[PDB]
Amino acid sequence: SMNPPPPETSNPNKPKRQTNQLQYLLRVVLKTLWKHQFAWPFQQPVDAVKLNLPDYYKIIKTPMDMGTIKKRLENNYYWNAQECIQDFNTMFTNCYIYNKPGDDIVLMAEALEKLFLQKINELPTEE
Numbered sequence: 467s468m469n470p471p472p473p474e475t476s477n478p479n480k481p482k483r484q485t486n487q488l489q490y491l492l493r494v495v496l497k498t499l500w501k502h503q504f505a506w507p508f509q510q511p512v513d514a515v516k517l518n519l520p521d522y523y524k525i526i527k528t529p530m531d532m533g534t535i536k537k538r539l540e541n542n543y544y545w546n547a548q549e550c551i552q553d554f555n556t557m558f559t560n561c562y563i564y565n566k567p568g569d570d571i572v573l574m575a576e577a578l579e580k581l582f583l584q585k586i587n588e589l590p591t592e593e
């Protein structure tokens with residue numbers, strides 16, 4: 467069984483930028499989530515080989531995880547905060563699409579998403 471290549475975390479042709487909102491996203495948002503007790507399943511791409519999930523990447527064609535998001539933020543991959551917010555939403559939605567209600571992973575995602583939304587509610591206005 468094989469995993470797909472992970473989402474890119476750098477791109478030679480993609481313009482790069484660091485905004486106050488992007489800094490908040492790394493320093494406050496990703497920080498709060500990364501250290502949460504439920505963060506670890508989301509800290510790297512889903513390893514469908516190790517987890518024996520042969521259908522994972524047949525169902526999930528836009529994978530995303532907080533390890534990828536962290537590297538994108540650190541590498542200044544993004545132009546704006548919305549791109550990063552979108553990656554978080556992709557991560558959460560993928561979890562709800564692939565998994566079933568009551569699954570442990572779904573309960574973990576829901577908790578993390580609640581914290582996520584709390585933190586982005588105070589996203590600072592762009593300078």
Ligand SMILES: Cn1cc(-c2cc(S(C)(=O)=O)ccc2OCC2CC2)c2cc(-c3cn(CCF)nn3)ccc2c1=O
Binds near residue numbers: 519
């Ligand atoms: C987003 N996500 C993440 C993981 C996950 C990934 C890793 S990882 C980074 O090392 O690949 C490490 C632990 C993980 O979940 C741990 C789980 C307790 C909460 C995941 C795992 C499964 C799964 C199914 N079964 C059945 C026996 F195999 N076992 N596990 C299903 C969906 C997901 C998913 O949707």
